Design a protein around this ligand. Structure first.
Ligand SMILES: O=C(O)c1ccccc1NS(=O)(=O)c1ccc(I)cc1
Length: 188
């Protein structure tokens, strides 16, 4: 591939210090994010292409879904705190976008319970200051990169993926171009 700024990626005006090596932003209300998870598995394939030991971080954003959107950001903090991201990502995505059965914080709770998280453990985490901190962290991270939309990925707080410029004739080619760009940028 011929990598060029503005094609597969763009460069931040003011790079973020102390930024995660690979940082993804998403929303459970975000249509492309649903595809990134369910059929493209972008995170898995980026992880596969990168060396073992490269930190990948994924944060949820507020600016989609109204009142429930903020709650999902807090719910994602709970998932990060308890380490059950892989347990709840699919039922949260489908609960919002597919079945539309997630309409309030109580429905989010039901999802965690059904995924095997004990109710008392969820409630303690939901109300915890560790989780409050994680919400603040997610919000600050987005502000630091002037985040305007999702899905989004940032490499070393300096480069932003540009999927719009990649080939969309074939799902696996799209994933290959995306992952290979992340690899290229990580070595940059
Ligand atoms: O759906 C689009 O138009 C699109 C264009 C560029 C990048 C992402 C897009 N959305 S998507 O993630 O749902 C998607 C990506 C690759 C393929 I093939 C189909 C959909």
């Amino acid at each position: 591939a011929q990598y060029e700024d503005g094609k597969q990626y763009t460069t931040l005006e003011k790079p973020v210090a102390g930024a995660p090596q690979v940082l993804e932003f998403f929303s459970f209300f975000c249509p492309h994010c649903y595809q990134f998870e369910e059929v493209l598995h972008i995170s898995d394939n980026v992880k596969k292409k990168l060396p073992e030991g490269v930190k990948m971080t994924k944060y949820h954003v507020n600016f989609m879904g109204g009142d429930l959107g903020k709650d999902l950001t807090q719910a994602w903090a709970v998932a990060m705190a308890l380490g059950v991201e892989d347990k709840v990502t699919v039922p949260l995505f489908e609960g919002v976008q597919k079945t539309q059965t997630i309409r309030s914080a109580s429905d989010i709770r039901d999802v965690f319970i059904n995924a095997g998280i004990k109710g008392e453990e969820y409630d303690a985490a939901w109300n915890s200051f560790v989780v409050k901190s994680l919400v603040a962290q997610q919000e600050k991270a987005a502000a630091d990169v002037q985040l305007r939309g999702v899905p989004a990925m940032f490499v070393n707080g300096k480069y932003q993926l540009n999927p719009q410029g990649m080939d969309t004739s074939n799902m696996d080619v799209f994933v290959q171009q995306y992952a290979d760009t992340v690899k290229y940028l990580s070595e940059k």
